[PDB]
């Protein structure tokens, strides 16, 4: 019974390898091939955010563009004003061991959650002028990567136990468990219609994910290593995963298939984070060899190098509008490049 | 330039002056992270993520025992790991050689000393005079070894010899690591990682003004 | 559940001391910057004082500058202003105004009581306007001018209406012309452009009548308008 359905799989998987092959006639390097060259592009540091007094981990924008939250170690989820530098809010956090956070697109909450196995929502409108905290959702036996939200009410975490999990922040527990992943999840993106979302594990195994059903619709390999970083294309028909292996993928819906790799001999060191222009053709991959990369994500060549981080590249992100860029670091600053 | 920006600003600069001084407050402590594995015996080594925090000489120590392959990176700015070892069983000997030649050659962990604790100490040298299991015969180079009851310390010198092998070989002496004997009934755990811990810091200040 | 109770006031013979208490509860009073505003028996609204969060930053009108002394205690949750040389201008009805300051916040969106004492350039703020009849159900406009225009270099025009219904204190509808205070029915919309604003009610009801005040937050001294009142 089990070789048999073992033999099943593997001529499974045959198949499905040999129906990727039959539907890839030309590639995205050929077509694009007579395309206009991006250029040189010089981002500068336009701000310099300090009063972090340790690493920061995660960074998320908020939806208008101008304010932003982080997270460090000493336990400090700072929300910040970009245009001016004034931090808007500093939140204590229960467990200095925070390794994600997030912005609601309304704005009104924000998400951290780390070693403790914790989703900690707070609140930031309330009457009585301090930052509380709204929810703590448990459930998952592992630490939590990372947590993006849906609306006010739903939000969607990958955590250490190899699972993702769909919360209902009202109830405080599980409306969906997505499973099928070996290792440990650490990274997610929500697709801009947030009606799926993708998922990156270390058994270097990203998986597309149906946010209404709850099951994996499509699963993509070619890694050779953990997946750090996963971000959706602006259209949502791709989307791109940094790894540990010094290299960038782009992976489409559709074709179900890689179409570029972004990847230099010089770079040896895993990507950490990663993120989209507004257009979708700049790919900021964030390293741990202190700087930034711009890939031209149509001809796979670096357009630019974002340097000025003394630590490692944690997080990396790009406003909602466009504008400019925020990076953080392990050295305690998180910067903003137009 | 206006009323409110002004007002936010001096809003900002109260979030700094707190902020500055909870960083003070908290780069008085030193945090230890505290590894192993089960039977170890590493939760009685010191009289989502677990936390302990005990003082000594008014000096406050942390210990952070999660339960170490992805997160432990997040553990990369700490003083000192302790790591525990049950050297009683023989049989799980060579696991906790390999988890701590993992824990040593680690890149997140290529600047913080290990205290290694060899627990139990007692059932070593109780096995050790029962004679009915051998070290010889998990580890064969034990025949021709010699010590610097004469078989018990030959044994735990043995024992230390293979853990300092392990520690020495691609050290570099970037960190260094400090063999320590213990027992369940032992009640000097506390001053001995307060003295590794002191040389520790003092070999970072020593590096840190340029000198040896 | 957030609660500015006042304490103090009272007759008080002229050239003499008096000191104002306000009591906050419910709210974190230290991270609120707070003001006092007076209004006079048969007058408008006029700023007092303003205290920082913190105490790091003072200001008060020159009416009352020299005689009149703000302060906070933030342990005890106390607000306190000290009275000297009280005049016959100086009977009024005192509120204390929370206020927080940051980026999307809403100062002035919390006001105290009243606490009465009877005592035996500048921008203008215009309300052309000193009385509305109106009818139930039928939309209304309250105009506005100001000398200089309140909008800013950074977008913001900071102009704040308020509402005081007959006997009761003022609150908060509308702060920077056009964002909509929390807890007030979307019936009120706030437009204009700089030196002239309007504030427009539609499907107009019951406990809607009162008196209307335009302030600008531009620049200190705040200073009101002299009040539309929509009445029945």
């Known amino acids: 019974e089990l070789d048999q359905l073992r033999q099943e799989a593997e001529q499974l998987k045959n198949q499905i390898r040999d129906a990727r092959k039959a539907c890839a006639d030309a590639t995205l390097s050929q077509i694009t091939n007579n395309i206009d060259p991006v250029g040189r592009i010089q981002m500068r540091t336009r701000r310099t955010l300090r009063g972090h007094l340790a690493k920061i981990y995660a960074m998320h924008w908020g939806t208008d563009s101008r304010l932003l939250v982080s997270a460090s170690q000493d336990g400090k989820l700072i929300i910040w004003d970009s245009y001016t530098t004034n931090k808007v809010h500093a939140i204590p956090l229960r467990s200095s061991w925070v390794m994600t956070c997030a912005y609601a697109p309304s704005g009104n909450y924000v998400a951290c959650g780390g070693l403790d196995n914790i989703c900690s929502i707070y609140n930031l409108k309330t009457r009585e002028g301090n930052v509380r905290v709204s929810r703590e959702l448990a459930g998952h036996t592992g630490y939590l990567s990372c947590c993006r939200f849906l609306d006010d009410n739903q939000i969607v975490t990958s955590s250490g136990d190899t699972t993702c999990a769909l919360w209902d922040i009202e109830t405080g527990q599980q409306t969906t468990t997505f499973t099928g992943h070996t290792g440990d999840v650490m990274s997610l993106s929500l697709a801009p219609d947030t009606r799926l979302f993708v998922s990156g594990a270390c058994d270097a195994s990203a998986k597309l994910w149906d946010v209404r059903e709850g099951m994996c619709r499509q699963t993509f390999t070619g890694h050779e290593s953990d997946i750090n970083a996963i971000c959706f294309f602006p259209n949502g028909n791709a989307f791109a995963t940094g790894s540990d292996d010094a290299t960038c993928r782009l992976f489409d819906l559709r074709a179900d298939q890689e179409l570029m790799t972004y990847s230099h001999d010089n770079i040896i060191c895993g990507i950490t984070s990663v993120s989209f222009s507004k257009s979708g053709r700049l790919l900021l991959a964030g390293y741990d060899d202190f700087n930034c990369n711009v890939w031209d994500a149509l001809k796979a060549d670096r357009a630019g190098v974002l340097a000025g981080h003394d630590n490692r590249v944690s997080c990396l992100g790009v406003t909602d509008d466009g504008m400019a860029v925020a990076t953080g670091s392990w050295d305690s600053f998180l910067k903003i490049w137009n | 330039v206006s009323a409110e920006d002004k007002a936010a600003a001096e809003r900002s600069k109260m979030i700094d002056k707190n902020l500055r001084e909870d960083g003070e407050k908290a780069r008085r402590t030193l945090r230890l992270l505290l590894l192993g594995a089960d039977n170890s015996g590493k939760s009685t080594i010191v009289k989502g993520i677990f936390e302990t925090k005990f003082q000594v000489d008014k000096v406050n120590f942390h210990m952070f025992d999660v339960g170490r392959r992805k997160w432990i990176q997040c553990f990369n700015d700490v003083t000192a790991i302790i790591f525990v070892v049950d050297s009683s069983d023989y049989n799980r000997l060579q696991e906790a050689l390999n988890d701590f030649k993992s824990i040593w050659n680690n890149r997140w962990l290529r600047t913080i000393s290990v205290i290694l604790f060899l627990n139990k100490q007692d059932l070593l040298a109780e096995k050790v005079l029962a004679g009915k299991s051998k070290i010889e015969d998990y580890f064969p180079e034990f025949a021709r070894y010699t010590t610097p009851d004469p078989r018990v310390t030959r044994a735990k010198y043995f024992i230390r010899k293979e853990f300092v092998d392990i520690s020495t070989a691609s050290g570099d002496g970037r960190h260094i690591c400090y063999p320590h004997f213990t027992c369940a009934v032992d009640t000097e755990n506390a001053r001995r990682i307060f003295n590794d811990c002191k040389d520790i810091i003092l070999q970072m200040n020593l590096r840190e003004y340029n000198l040896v | 559940d957030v609660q500015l109770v006042e304490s103090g006031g009272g007759l008080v013979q002229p050239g003499g001391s008096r000191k104002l208490s306000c009591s906050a509860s419910?709210?974190?009073?230290?991270?609120?910057?707070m003001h006092w505003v007076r209004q006079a028996p048969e007058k408008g609204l006029e700023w007092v004082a303003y205290?920082?969060?913190?105490?790091?930053?003072?200001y008060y009108a020159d009416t009352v500058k020299g005689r009149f002394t703000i302060s906070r205690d933030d342990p005890k949750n106390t607000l306190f202003l000290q009275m000297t040389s009280l005049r016959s201008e100086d009977t009024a009805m005192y509120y204390c105004?929370?206020?927080?300051?940051?980026?999307?916040?809403?100062?002035?969106?919390?006001w105290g009581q009243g606490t009465t004492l009877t005592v035996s350039s500048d921008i203008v703020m215009t309300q052309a306007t000193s009385s509305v009849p109106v009818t139930p159900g039928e939309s209304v406009s309250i105009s506005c001018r100001s000398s200089?225009?309140?909008?800013?270099?950074?977008?913001?025009?900071?102009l704040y209406w308020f509402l005081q219904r007959p006997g009761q204190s003022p609150q908060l509808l509308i702060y920077?012309?056009?964002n909509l205070a929390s807890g007030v029915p979307d019936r009120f919309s706030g437009s204009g452009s700089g030196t002239a604003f309007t504030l427009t009610i539609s499907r107009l009801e019951a406990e809607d009548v009162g008196v209307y005040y335009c302030?600008?937050?531009?620049?200190?001294?705040?200073?009101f308008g002299a009040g539309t009142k929509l009445e029945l």
């Open positions: 419910g709210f974190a009073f230290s991270s609120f910057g």
């Open positions: 105004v929370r206020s927080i300051y940051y980026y999307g916040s809403s100062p002035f969106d919390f």
């Open positions: 200089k225009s309140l909008l800013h270099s950074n977008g913001n025009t900071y």
């Open positions: 302030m600008q937050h531009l620049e200190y001294p705040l200073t």
């Open positions: 205290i920082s969060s913190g105490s790091g930053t003072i």
């Open positions: 920077r012309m056009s």
